[PDB]
């Protein structure tokens, strides 16, 4: 087998603007436990998933979307628009909503993948 074995969904209502980001966070985190081959985080990984056109939905904290350092900011905004170029979805997270401190464990920048990108799950 493969699927099954202890999994849930903490579904609850929220503000619809927040709840799109939260759904993407949730759907992402599900995979992050299961198969992080479909759940990329950290700018570099996401930039590789963009080459793969594999990005279903791209997560970023708005504070990174408007980083102070021009080069740092540039990367994120470039990658963001370049996912729209690849017809992926974009999700703008808030520092305020708990989904921001959540994303912080993942450098505040991630994306869900439609297929497991050919770089494997995670490493040690």
Q: Which residues of 97-124 are buried (b: 16+ CB within 10 A; e: fewer)?
A: bebbebbeebbbbbbbbeebbeeeeeee
Range of the domain at 40: 14-120
> How many folded domains does the chain comprise?
1
With CA atoms as reference, report the closest residue to 84 among 58, 109, 48.
58
With CA atoms as reference, report the closest residue to 29 among 98, 77, 124.
98
In a domain, 91, yes or no: yes
In a domain, 39, yes or no: yes
Q: What CATH number corresponds to the domain at position 108?
A: 3.30.1330.30
In a domain, 3, yes or no: no
CA dihedral (11, 5, 120, 52) positive or negative: negative
β-strand partners of 59: 91, 110
In a domain, 9, yes or no: no
In a domain, 7, yes or no: no
d(C-alpha 39, C-alpha 103), whole Å: 12
In a domain, 5, yes or no: no
In a domain, 50, yes or no: yes
Task: State the method.
Answer: NMR
d(C-alpha 23, C-alpha 39), whole Å: 14
Tokens of 89: 């979805």
Tokens of 18: 């927040």
d(C-alpha 77, C-alpha 60), whole Å: 10
In a domain, 94, yes or no: yes
């Amino acid at each position: 087998g493969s699927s099954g074995s202890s999994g849930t969904v903490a579904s609850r209502l929220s503000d619809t603007k927040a709840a799109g980001e939260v759904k993407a966070l949730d759907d992402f985190y599900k995979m992050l436990q299961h198969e992080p081959d479909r759940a990329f985080y950290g700018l570099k990984q996401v930039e590789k998933a963009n080459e793969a056109m594999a990005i279903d939905t791209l997560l970023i904290s708005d504070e990174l979307f408007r980083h102070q350092d021009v080069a740092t900011r540039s990367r994120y905004v470039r990658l963001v628009d370049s996912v729209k170029e690849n017809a992926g979805t974009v999700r703008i997270f808030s520092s305020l909503h708990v989904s921001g401190e959540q994303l912080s464990q993942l450098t505040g920048v991630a994306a869900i993948l439609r297929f497991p990108v050919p770089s494997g799950p995670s490493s040690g």
